[PDB]
């Protein structure tokens, strides 16, 4: 029930995110890479990652109103599926790499920064997208439509064959899902927590004085480290949490009454997670004065 809210809400989310990302990307692209201070190349990578995140939405827009009937071809589903895979988790790891670079650069610049010249040039982005491609490799082309009942209405689902023994199929889906969620749920979480806590500790032990002129600096900077991590967590956590819960629900009984609500809110939880990509420009670029 209440299925008419989701199409319009992600229409609005798409509009806002596309507008903000375009405004950011025009500014970051119009400037040369060399003149950028430390990580504007990574910022532009995040912007294009959000662009790849959003551009697969127009083809997915009227999908709900056509009610799981895909006449556009399974191949487009195969493309857009690994597209959305790659953009979402590569964006999480892009945030991860950017925050790790900030950790390295601020926590101890005197001892560190020996490898900064190596990391900052192209190797970080190179290995990031290489890891993204490697994670995409098992699910590059893994989409087959499901006949379901005798009803002609079918849609391009993902491949359920993975030809092996009967028990091996279940293991295949559960393992791929758990790994795909777990990498970007646990590695970025630890990176965010450790790096931001260390940044807070370094500023706390570095300032050594609560100057009234510097009090505003201290407060707003501490607020920045609070808000960045809290937004990332409170936005992208619930989707992975609920998907993992439902995957574990195969083992447990969990009568259909609860699964009804769970799978009714999982489509909502998708956008409850998408809001992070929606509002991260205000988190990163909009606060930075020299974008404006």
């Amino acid at each position: 029930s209440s299925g008419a809210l989701i199409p319009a809400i992600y229409m609005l989310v798409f509009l806002l995110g596309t507008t903000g990302n375009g405004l950011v990307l025009w500014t970051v692209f119009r400037s040369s890479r060399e003149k950028r201070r430390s990580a504007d190349i990574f910022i532009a990578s995040l912007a294009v990652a959000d662009l790849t995140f959003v551009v697969t939405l127009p083809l997915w827009a009227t999908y709900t109103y056509r009610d799981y009937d895909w006449p556009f071809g399974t191949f487009a589903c195969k493309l857009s599926s690994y597209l959305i895979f790659v953009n979402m988790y590569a964006s999480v790891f892009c945030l991860t790499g950017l925050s790790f670079d900030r950790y390295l650069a601020i926590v101890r610049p005197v001892a560190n920064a020996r490898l900064r010249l190596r990391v900052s040039g192209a190797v970080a982005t190179a290995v990031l997208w290489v890891l993204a491609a490697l994670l995409a490799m098992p699910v590059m082309v893994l989409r087959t439509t499901g006949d379901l009942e005798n009803t002609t209405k079918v849609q391009c689902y993902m491949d359920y064959s993975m030809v092996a023994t009967v028990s091996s199929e279940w293991a295949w889906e559960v393992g791929l899902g758990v790994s795909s969620t777990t990498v970007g749920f646990v590695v970025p979480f630890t990176i965010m927590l450790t790096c931001y806590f260390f940044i807070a500790q370094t500023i706390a032990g570095h300032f050594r004085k609560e100057r009234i002129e510097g009090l505003r600096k201290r407060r707003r900077l501490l607020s920045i480290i609070v808000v960045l991590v809290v937004t990332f967590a409170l936005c992208w956590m619930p989707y992975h949490l609920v998907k993992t819960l439902y995957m574990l629900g195969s083992l447990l009984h969990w009568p259909c009454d609860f699964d009804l609500f769970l799978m009714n809110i999982f489509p909502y939880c998708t956008c409850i997670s998408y809001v992070n990509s929606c509002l991260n420009p205000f988190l990163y670029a909009f606060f930075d004065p020299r974008f404006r």
Binding site: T64, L148, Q155, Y157, Y246, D259, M263, F266, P267, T270
Partner: peptide, 15 residues
């Protein structure tokens, strides 16, 4: 009634 297998992997998700 009975919940269909469509929304598990199809309705919206990309697992």
């Amino acid at each position: 009634l009975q919940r269909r297998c469509m929304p598990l992997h199809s309705r919206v998700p990309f697992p």
